[PDB]
């Protein structure tokens, strides 16, 4: 009371200010591109390709923006956050940044001027990137063409737009700076895979559920989350697909975008194996796959893979062979989807993904199935050279609900979904009619 409460509040305030406030490194003249060594440029190119630097630092909405120029819109639940320009621009960019300032931003999320960056920039994962990789990718960034584009202004409100207090509190509650620590309990390949997956590649950025404050639930790592309407399925034991995510399946999925059993990488995973993970050394992808196979615990769960595949083959051809005068939802599925989704042989045929094994039918919600039905899969989106028609206008919400209910009842052994029509409408409300086909 009085003196005591004032004193303790002042102590807490000065402590929070000392923690949150960071000095601003003096800006340096723009480094010449010739200074950096050629090999460092290639190593930084590999590092930045691994981190998907150009994915969410390029403007996609409206007109396409310049590479690495920022202005990418992120529809955060708290508001809209626009990625900063990381091209070596003198004023609106990192051109005046020094190596120390960029390293500080990578390890702590503090900009050159001392301001704190939002957790939309996943510094909690990039803080594990080693000094050598940081220097390499700084050298790579500083030699990219400069863009004089200014990112648009954020729409985040009070009291979250106040960078100092809000971001300092968020970092205090959840952020833990520090490079990845080598684990002696596992081999070099597993350590490299863990370093990449939890570091540069930040697989848990959208594969781990987040609480109300946007922080990843460390007690539910790789438990699957919801991003952009799609569902990122669990990357651990909790994956509901009947076939285990073996090392070979993981490597195929992460390198070529298609797996022999589970299927192809669509939606938000269209670019990850296609645009980024295919431009990094194959050893890195192999290490990531091995690490996640260890995390997935495939060595114990792989015993039942043959039985699961046989059961899926049995149920894949259900109602697709012989006369079908009884079930009308089965007729709709056969007419609309069964032509390219029927499998008979002991193993699936590449190019005909097995719905009885896919996560779209085994997940808790029909989000992935509805999103695939609506958007479709382009030629280079999932598996290479092959495409999938979009059923935005071919199927109404009722028809999509009928197909989803029939597939869940028949192609899986799980209990039926709930509110399928409302969920179908919600999924449809996130796009803008890919075809002008109509002609219902």
């Amino acid at each position: 009371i009085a003196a005591a409460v004032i004193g303790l509040g002042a102590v807490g305030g000065i402590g929070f200010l000392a923690y949150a406030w960071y000095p601003a490194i003096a800006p340096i003249p723009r480094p010449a591109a010739s200074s950096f060594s050629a090999d460092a440029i290639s190593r930084g190119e590999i590092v930045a390709n691994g981190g998907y630097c150009a994915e969410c630092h390029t403007r996609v909405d409206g007109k396409p923006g310049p590479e690495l120029a920022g202005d990418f819109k992120m529809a955060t639940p708290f508001g809209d956050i626009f990625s900063s320009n990381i091209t070596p621009d003198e004023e609106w960019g990192i051109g005046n940044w020094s190596l120390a300032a960029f390293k500080r931003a990578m390890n702590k999320g503090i900009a050159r001027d001392g301001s704190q960056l939002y957790p939309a920039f996943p510094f909690d994962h990039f803080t594990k990137v080693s000094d050598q990789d940081v220097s390499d990718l700084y050298a790579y960034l500083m030699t990219r063409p400069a863009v004089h584009l200014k990112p648009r202004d954020n729409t985040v409100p009070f009291p979250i737009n106040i960078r100092l207090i809000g971001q300092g509190f968020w970092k205090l509650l959840f952020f833990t700076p520090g490079r990845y620590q080598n684990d002696p309990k596992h081999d070099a390949q597993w350590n490299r895979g863990a370093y990449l997956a939890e570091g540069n590649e930040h697989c848990g950025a959208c594969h781990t559920p987040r609480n109300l404050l946007g922080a990843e639930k460390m007690s539910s790592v790789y438990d699957g989350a919801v991003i952009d309407g799609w569902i990122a399925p669990p990357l651990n034991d909790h994956n509901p697909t009947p076939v285990v995510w073996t090392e070979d399946e993981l490597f195929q999925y992460l390198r070529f975008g298609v797996a022999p059993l589970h299927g192809s990488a669509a939606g938000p995973m269209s670019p990850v194996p296609h645009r980024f993970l295919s431009k990094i050394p194959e050893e890195d992808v192999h290490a990531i796959a091995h690490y996640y196979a260890d995390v997935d615990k495939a060595a114990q769960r792989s015993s039942g893979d043959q039985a699961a595949i046989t059961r899926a083959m049995q149920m894949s051809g259900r109602d697709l062979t012989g006369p079908q005068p009884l079930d009308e939802d089965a007729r709709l599925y056969q007419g609309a989807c069964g032509a390219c989704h029927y499998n008979s042989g002991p193993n699936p045929v590449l190019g005909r993904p097995e719905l009885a094994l896919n996560n779209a039918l085994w997940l808790d919600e029909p989000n992935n199935l509805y999103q695939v039905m609506l958007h479709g899969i382009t030629a280079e989106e999932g598996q290479d050279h092959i495409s999938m028609p979009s059923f935005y206008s071919g199927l109404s919400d009722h028809d999509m609900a009928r197909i989803a209910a029939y597939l869940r009842r028949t192609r899986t052994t799980l209990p039926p979904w709930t509110d399928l029509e409302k969920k179908a409408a919600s999924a449809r409300a996130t796009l803008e009619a890919p075809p002008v086909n109509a002609s219902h």
Binding site: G322, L326, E328, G335, S439, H440
Partner: protein, 732 residues
């Protein structure tokens, strides 16, 4: 002359003995085909007939699908399976005339009398000397022409064993259809073409446009304008066509148009309402026209009220769903209205097009293209008028009006739901039929589209031949009265249309199911019961040359079926049965005696009915094209199977309920049963084969169901839910 099928005709003139065939100086022989090529390969069969009669080389035969011209004078009708049957005599006479001219000219060139020279394989010879047809045309240059009455008295060849007829021959149109080179109505491209799409009114008839709001559609790139169709003929009332430079733009513009309508008086009419109106119409004995009314039917029926067996059978609506949606290109070029579309009956729609365009009939010409499946849908021709009106709205510039699947199904002239009541009076022994009373209420497509083609019954009143056909049975049922009643509610609500085997797909259903029910109720064998009434006495004695032998002929095929399937000693496992059903084909004037047997296993739990085997035996006289005949019979049998077990729709709020394949369920490849089709071999006059296969499939299956689980179904299609309901009721 639009498309010569095997190859283009040589450009060195030709000799035309008549209007049906021409002979080029190089030996090529062109045959003018006026029948629509909707998939039955009619041109190949007609060419076979004319080449066999002409005694010409088949390798020199080409067929031209000619456009509408005054020289053929309303011969462009293709329906009711009349093509081969009607063209038999005409093409035989034409070939005989051409062969006679060739024989005479070859004899003159070779210096011999015509009585000794003989022509074969497109060359006429007299002993050792010989000369081909092309050389004859090049040298003699014949100019003789034959009028139809001149050809009607020529010495035709004997109808026995022929050279080209009843021999396997590849179809002329198949090679083009395999490589995607066949041109349909939807493939037509004209200079300055503008695409168009309609906005369907809420009702088929009596719809009026109040206001149109095109502000939303003006933001669509490529959208030009909208036209509100004013129809002098009143065929497409209340239509609004949106025009664009590209078809997707037209689709989007039509979707974005805001049109206010007066719905009309039939906006809340359901299928049950139509069936109830049919029942009410059939209740009154004075309604309808008696197709034949023998004296004493009432006395026979009412003498013994306790010995009357009556049943009622209903058939639901069926949609064509022809694969190519109805479309047409229209333009006004060189002072003539050109319509490019696939049509089955050009001679019927030409006067309507002329009336709608307010031009003389000689100023309208319809180019002929391959049909993406007619099935009686293209007999309508109501889709050509909106394209012509839209073209007239912009001054005659080409307009390609294409209907989407939803619009095509809304405009579809569906098969009207029908209800038939059959009531017989038996003798004292309850074994023989003494009197018969047949009534059938349905929509009348001929009374709507072609009122001038209505037939006259024994009552002296006009009736639709394509709404009662198949009920004029050949059985010996004593005094028989057959009545056809026109459902005015069906005519007003929608446009009743001709389906494949029109009115012969549901009359045999009721008739054969009723006959089997009566046979089982009187403790009689259905086959023996049917054969005992095939006495072929009276009106069923048969005429010549079409129905030679009368009802006996039908009995023959039935007997053949009873020998093909082992009917006498057929032992089947539990819940398995065999059902038989016979019919005389399409019409009494041109009968195609057919019989069918179905082996059916009925699942007592789910009610699913599976056809293990389907036998068909047909007597269509001479089989001109064995492969074509087999293909047509297979298609017709599968159409009947689909209508009996799979296809079917409903009328909700005055319009068909299903709008695309998401709800409509036609037959697909996995559902095809095992079919065994046999043709009776004889030398009689050929009859139609495209339609008759549909006639007998539906009742037979139903009969088989009664032989499997003992439940009787009197509604088409027979869905598993109905079987489950019947089984649950029988359990009680």
């Amino acid at each position: 002359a639009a498309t010569t099928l095997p190859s283009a005709m040589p450009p060195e003139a030709a000799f035309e003995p008549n209007i049906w065939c021409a002979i080029a100086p190089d030996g090529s022989i062109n045959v003018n085909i006026v029948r629509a090529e909707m998939g039955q390969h009619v041109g190949t069969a007609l060419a076979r007939i004319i080449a066999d009669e002409m005694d010409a080389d088949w390798d020199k035969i080409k067929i031209t699908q000619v456009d509408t011209a005054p020289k053929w004078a309303g011969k462009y009708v293709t329906g009711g399976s009349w093509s081969v049957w009607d063209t038999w005599d005409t093409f035989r006479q034409a070939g005989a005339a051409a062969r006679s001219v060739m024989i005479e000219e070859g004899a003159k060139l070779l210096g011999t009398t015509p009585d000794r020279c003989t022509a074969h394989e497109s060359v006429v010879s007299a002993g050792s000397k010989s000369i081909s047809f092309g050389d004859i045309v090049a040298r003699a240059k014949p100019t003789r022409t034959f009028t139809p009455e001149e050809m009607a008295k020529l010495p035709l060849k004997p109808t026995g064993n022929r050279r080209l007829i009843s021999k396997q021959v590849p179809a002329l149109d198949i090679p083009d259809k395999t490589t995607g080179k066949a041109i349909y109505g939807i493939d037509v491209k004209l200079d300055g073409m503008v695409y168009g799409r309609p906005k369907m009114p809420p009702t088929r008839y009596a719809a009026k446009v109040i206001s149109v709001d095109d502000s939303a559609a003006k933001k669509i790139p490529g959208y030009l304008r909208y036209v509100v169709l004013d129809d002098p003929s009143g065929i497409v009332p209340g239509w609004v066509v949106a025009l664009a430079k590209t078809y997707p733009a037209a689709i989007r513009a039509a979707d974005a148009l805001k049109v206010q309508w007066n719905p009309g008086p039939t906006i809340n009419v359901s299928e049950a309402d139509i069936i109830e109106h049919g029942r009410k119409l059939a209740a009154d004995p004075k309604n309808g026209t008696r197709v034949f009314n023998d004296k004493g039917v009432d006395e026979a029926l009412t003498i013994h009220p306790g010995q009357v067996f009556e049943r009622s059978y209903t058939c639901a609506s069926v949609a064509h769903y022809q694969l190519e949606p109805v479309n047409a290109v229209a333009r006004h070029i060189d002072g003539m209205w050109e319509i490019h579309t696939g049509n089955q009956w050009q001679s019927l729609i030409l006067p309507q097009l002329a009336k709608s365009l307010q031009v003389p009939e000689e100023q309208v010409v319809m180019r002929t293209y391959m049909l993406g499946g007619g099935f009686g849908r293209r007999l309508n021709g109501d889709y050509c008028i909106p394209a012509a009106l839209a073209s007239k709205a912009i001054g005659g510039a080409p307009v390609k009006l294409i209907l989407t699947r939803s619009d095509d199904m809304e405009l579809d002239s569906i098969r009207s739901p029908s209800i038939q009541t059959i009531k017989v009076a038996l003798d004292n022994d309850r074994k023989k039929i003494v009197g018969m009373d047949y009534v059938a209420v349905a929509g009348w497509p001929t009374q709507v589209m072609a009122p001038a083609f209505l037939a006259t019954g024994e009552d002296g009143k006009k009736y639709d031949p394509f709404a009662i056909a198949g009920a004029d049975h050949w059985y010996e049922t004593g005094p028989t009265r057959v009545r056809a009643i026109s459902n005015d509610l069906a005519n007003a609500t929608f446009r009743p249309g001709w389906l494949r085997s029109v009115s012969a797909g549901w009359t045999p259903w009721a008739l054969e199911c009723f006959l089997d029910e009566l046979a089982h109720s009187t403790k009689q064998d259905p086959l023996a019961f049917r054969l005992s009434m095939f006495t072929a006495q009276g009106r069923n004695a048969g005429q010549a040359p079409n129905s030679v032998g009368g009802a006996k002929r039908q009995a023959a095929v039935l007997q053949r079926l009873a020998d093909k399937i082992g009917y006498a000693n057929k032992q089947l496992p539990a819940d398995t049965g065999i059902g038989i059903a016979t019919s005389f084909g399409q019409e009494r004037g041109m009968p195609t005696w057919t019989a069918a047997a179905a082996q059916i296993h009925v699942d007592r739990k789910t009610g699913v009915v599976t056809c293990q085997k389907l036998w068909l035996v047909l007597d269509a006289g001479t089989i001109v094209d064995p492969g074509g005949a087999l293909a047509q019979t297979e298609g017709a049998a599968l159409w009947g199977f689909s209508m009996a077990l799979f296809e079917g729709t409903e009328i909700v709020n005055g319009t068909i309920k299903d709008r695309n394949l998401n709800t409509y369920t036609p037959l697909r490849i996995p559902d095809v049963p095992d079919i065994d089709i046999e043709f009776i071999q004889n030398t009689e006059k050929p009859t139609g084969l495209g339609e008759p296969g549909v006639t007998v499939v539906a009742p037979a299956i139903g009969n088989a169901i009664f032989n499997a689980v003992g439940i009787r179904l009197r509604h088409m299609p027979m869905r598993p839910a109905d079987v489950r309901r019947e089984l649950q009721q029988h359990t009680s």
